[PDB]
Amino acid sequence: RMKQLEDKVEELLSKAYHLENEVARLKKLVG
Amino acid sequence: RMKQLEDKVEELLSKAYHLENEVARLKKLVGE
Amino acid sequence: RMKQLEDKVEELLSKAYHLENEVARLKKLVGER
Ligand SMILES: [Cl-]
Ligand SMILES: [Cl-]
Ligand SMILES: [Cl-]
Ligand SMILES: [Cl-]
Ligand SMILES: [Cl-]
Ligand SMILES: [Cl-]
Ligand SMILES: [Cl-]
Ligand SMILES: [Cl-]
Ligand SMILES: [K+]
Ligand SMILES: [K+]
Protein backbone atom coordinates (compact mmCIF):
# COMPACT_ATOMS: atom_id res chain seq x y z
CA ARG A 1 0.00 0.00 0.00
CA MET A 2 2.90 2.33 0.81
CA LYS A 3 4.72 2.17 -2.56
CA GLN A 4 1.51 2.50 -4.62
CA LEU A 5 0.58 5.53 -2.44
CA GLU A 6 3.95 7.24 -3.01
CA ASP A 7 3.71 6.60 -6.72
CA LYS A 8 0.15 7.99 -7.05
CA VAL A 9 1.10 11.10 -5.06
CA GLU A 10 4.06 11.79 -7.34
CA GLU A 11 1.87 11.30 -10.40
CA LEU A 12 -0.77 13.61 -8.98
CA LEU A 13 1.85 16.34 -8.43
CA SER A 14 3.25 15.98 -11.94
CA LYS A 15 -0.30 16.11 -13.39
CA ALA A 16 -1.08 19.19 -11.33
CA TYR A 17 2.07 20.95 -12.59
CA HIS A 18 1.12 20.01 -16.15
CA LEU A 19 -2.39 21.38 -15.65
CA GLU A 20 -1.03 24.64 -14.06
CA ASN A 21 1.08 25.36 -17.16
CA GLU A 22 -1.80 24.45 -19.55
CA VAL A 23 -4.05 26.90 -17.70
CA ALA A 24 -1.26 29.56 -17.96
CA ARG A 25 -1.00 28.98 -21.75
CA LEU A 26 -4.85 29.23 -21.97
CA LYS A 27 -4.73 32.52 -19.98
CA LYS A 28 -2.49 33.86 -22.82
CA LEU A 29 -5.35 33.27 -25.24
CA VAL A 30 -8.21 34.58 -23.13
CA GLY A 31 -7.31 36.54 -20.00
CA ARG B 1 -10.03 23.84 -24.35
CA MET B 2 -11.62 25.55 -21.29
CA LYS B 3 -13.97 22.65 -20.58
CA GLN B 4 -11.11 20.10 -21.05
CA LEU B 5 -9.16 21.90 -18.30
CA GLU B 6 -12.18 22.26 -16.00
CA ASP B 7 -12.85 18.51 -16.33
CA LYS B 8 -9.17 17.77 -15.64
CA VAL B 9 -9.07 19.90 -12.47
CA GLU B 10 -12.16 18.12 -11.11
CA GLU B 11 -10.66 14.70 -11.95
CA LEU B 12 -7.41 15.56 -10.12
CA LEU B 13 -9.24 17.14 -7.14
CA SER B 14 -11.20 13.91 -6.77
CA LYS B 15 -7.99 11.86 -6.84
CA ALA B 16 -6.45 14.22 -4.35
CA TYR B 17 -9.41 13.80 -1.92
CA HIS B 18 -9.29 9.98 -2.10
CA LEU B 19 -5.51 9.95 -1.64
CA GLU B 20 -6.01 12.14 1.45
CA ASN B 21 -8.47 9.52 2.79
CA GLU B 22 -5.87 6.76 2.18
CA VAL B 23 -3.18 8.76 3.97
CA ALA B 24 -5.41 9.25 7.00
CA ARG B 25 -6.19 5.48 7.06
CA LEU B 26 -2.49 4.59 6.91
CA LYS B 27 -1.53 7.15 9.59
CA LYS B 28 -4.07 5.64 12.01
CA LEU B 29 -2.78 2.12 11.25
CA VAL B 30 0.90 2.84 11.81
CA GLY B 31 -0.04 4.85 14.92
CA GLU B 32 -1.45 1.79 16.71
CA ARG C 1 -14.80 31.00 -15.46
CA MET C 2 -11.02 31.55 -15.87
CA LYS C 3 -10.58 32.81 -12.28
CA GLN C 4 -12.60 29.86 -10.89
CA LEU C 5 -10.41 27.50 -12.94
CA GLU C 6 -7.25 29.11 -11.58
CA ASP C 7 -8.56 28.94 -8.01
CA LYS C 8 -9.17 25.19 -8.39
CA VAL C 9 -5.72 24.61 -9.85
CA GLU C 10 -4.08 26.39 -6.94
CA GLU C 11 -6.27 24.37 -4.51
CA LEU C 12 -5.11 21.19 -6.27
CA LEU C 13 -1.45 22.11 -6.14
CA SER C 14 -1.63 22.94 -2.41
CA LYS C 15 -3.28 19.57 -1.77
CA ALA C 16 -0.71 17.68 -3.84
CA TYR C 17 2.16 19.33 -1.91
CA HIS C 18 0.47 18.55 1.42
CA LEU C 19 0.05 14.94 0.25
CA GLU C 20 3.72 14.77 -0.74
CA ASN C 21 4.71 16.01 2.73
CA GLU C 22 2.32 13.60 4.46
CA VAL C 23 3.64 10.62 2.46
CA ALA C 24 7.24 11.55 3.37
CA ARG C 25 6.30 11.61 7.08
CA LEU C 26 4.50 8.26 6.83
CA LYS C 27 7.40 6.68 4.94
CA LYS C 28 9.70 7.59 7.83
CA LEU C 29 7.22 6.21 10.39
CA VAL C 30 6.94 2.91 8.47
CA GLY C 31 10.70 2.75 7.91
CA GLU C 32 10.78 0.96 4.56
CA ARG C 33 12.96 1.87 1.57
CL1 LIG D 1 -3.53 9.79 -11.58
CL1 LIG E 1 -3.20 14.36 -17.01
CL1 LIG F 1 -4.90 8.30 -7.76
CL1 LIG G 1 -8.80 16.69 0.75
CL1 LIG H 1 -11.60 6.91 -0.24
CL1 LIG I 1 -15.45 32.05 -20.81
CL1 LIG J 1 -1.45 31.61 -7.12
CL1 LIG K 1 1.00 14.57 8.56
K1 LIG L 1 -4.15 18.87 -18.55
K1 LIG M 1 -16.70 22.14 -9.31
UniProtKB/Swiss-Prot annotation, chain A:
Induction: Translation is induced by amino acid or purine starvation, or during growth in low or poor carbon sources. Translational repression during nutrient-rich conditions is dependent on four uORFs (upstream open reading frames) present in the 5'-UTR of the mRNA; these promote ribosome dissociation. Translational induction occurs in conditions reducing translation machinery efficiency, leading to ribosomes scanning over the uORFs, and increased translation of the mRNA. The rapid translational induction is followed by transcriptional induction at later time-points, independently of the uORF sequences.
Gene ablation phenotype (knockout): Abolishes recruitment of the mediator complex to the upstream activating sequence (UAS) of amino-acid starvation responsive genes. Decreases RNA level of genes involved in amino acid biosynthesis and cofactor biosynthesis during amino acid starvation or methyl methanesulfonate stress. Growth dependent on amino acid supplementation. Sensitive to amino acid starvation. Sensitive to purine starvation. Decreases cellular glycogen levels during glucose starvation.
Leucine-zipper, as annotated region: 5-26
Domain of life, per lineage: Eukaryota
Post-translational modification: Phosphorylated by the cyclin-CDK PCL5-PHO85.
Disulphide bridges, residue numbers: none
Domain remarks in the Swiss-Prot or TrEMBL record: Residues 89 to 100 and 106 to 125 define the N-terminal activation domain (NTAD) and the central acidic activation domain (CAAD) respectively, which can function independently to promote high-level transcription of the target genes.
Family listed: Belongs to the bZIP family. GCN4 subfamily.
Function: Master transcriptional regulator that mediates the response to amino acid starvation. Binds variations of the DNA sequence 5'-ATGA[CG]TCAT-3' in canonical nucleosome-depleted 5'-positioned promoters, and also within coding sequences and 3' non-coding regions. During nutrient starvation (low or poor amino acid, carbon or purine sources), it activates genes required for amino acid biosynthesis and transport, autophagy, cofactor biosynthesis and transport, mitochondrial transport, and additional downstream transcription factors.
Subunit annotation: Homodimer. Each subunit binds overlapping and non-identical half-sites that flank the central CG base-pair in the pseudo-palindromic motif 5'-ATGA[CG]TCAT-3'. Interacts with the mediator tail; the interaction with GAL11/MED15 is direct. Interacts with the SAGA histone acetyltransferase complex. Interacts with the SWI/SNF chromatin remodeling complex.
Protein name listed in UniProt: General control transcription factor GCN4
Organism: Saccharomyces cerevisiae (strain ATCC 204508 / S288c) (Baker's yeast)
Boundaries of the shown chain within the full protein: 249 to 279 of 281
UniProtKB/Swiss-Prot annotation, chain C:
Entry's induction text: Translation is induced by amino acid or purine starvation, or during growth in low or poor carbon sources. Translational repression during nutrient-rich conditions is dependent on four uORFs (upstream open reading frames) present in the 5'-UTR of the mRNA; these promote ribosome dissociation. Translational induction occurs in conditions reducing translation machinery efficiency, leading to ribosomes scanning over the uORFs, and increased translation of the mRNA. The rapid translational induction is followed by transcriptional induction at later time-points, independently of the uORF sequences.
Reported modifications of this chain: Phosphorylated by the cyclin-CDK PCL5-PHO85.
Disruption phenotype: Abolishes recruitment of the mediator complex to the upstream activating sequence (UAS) of amino-acid starvation responsive genes. Decreases RNA level of genes involved in amino acid biosynthesis and cofactor biosynthesis during amino acid starvation or methyl methanesulfonate stress. Growth dependent on amino acid supplementation. Sensitive to amino acid starvation. Sensitive to purine starvation. Decreases cellular glycogen levels during glucose starvation.
Subcellular compartments: Nucleus
Residue runs in coiled coils: none
Similarity-based family: Belongs to the bZIP family. GCN4 subfamily.
Function: Master transcriptional regulator that mediates the response to amino acid starvation. Binds variations of the DNA sequence 5'-ATGA[CG]TCAT-3' in canonical nucleosome-depleted 5'-positioned promoters, and also within coding sequences and 3' non-coding regions. During nutrient starvation (low or poor amino acid, carbon or purine sources), it activates genes required for amino acid biosynthesis and transport, autophagy, cofactor biosynthesis and transport, mitochondrial transport, and additional downstream transcription factors.
Domains (record comment): Residues 89 to 100 and 106 to 125 define the N-terminal activation domain (NTAD) and the central acidic activation domain (CAAD) respectively, which can function independently to promote high-level transcription of the target genes.
Subunit structure: Homodimer. Each subunit binds overlapping and non-identical half-sites that flank the central CG base-pair in the pseudo-palindromic motif 5'-ATGA[CG]TCAT-3'. Interacts with the mediator tail; the interaction with GAL11/MED15 is direct. Interacts with the SAGA histone acetyltransferase complex. Interacts with the SWI/SNF chromatin remodeling complex.
Protein name listed in UniProt: General control transcription factor GCN4
Native organism taxonomy: Eukaryota, Fungi, Dikarya, Ascomycota, Saccharomycotina
Encoding gene (name): GCN4
Full protein: residues contained: 249 to 281 of 281
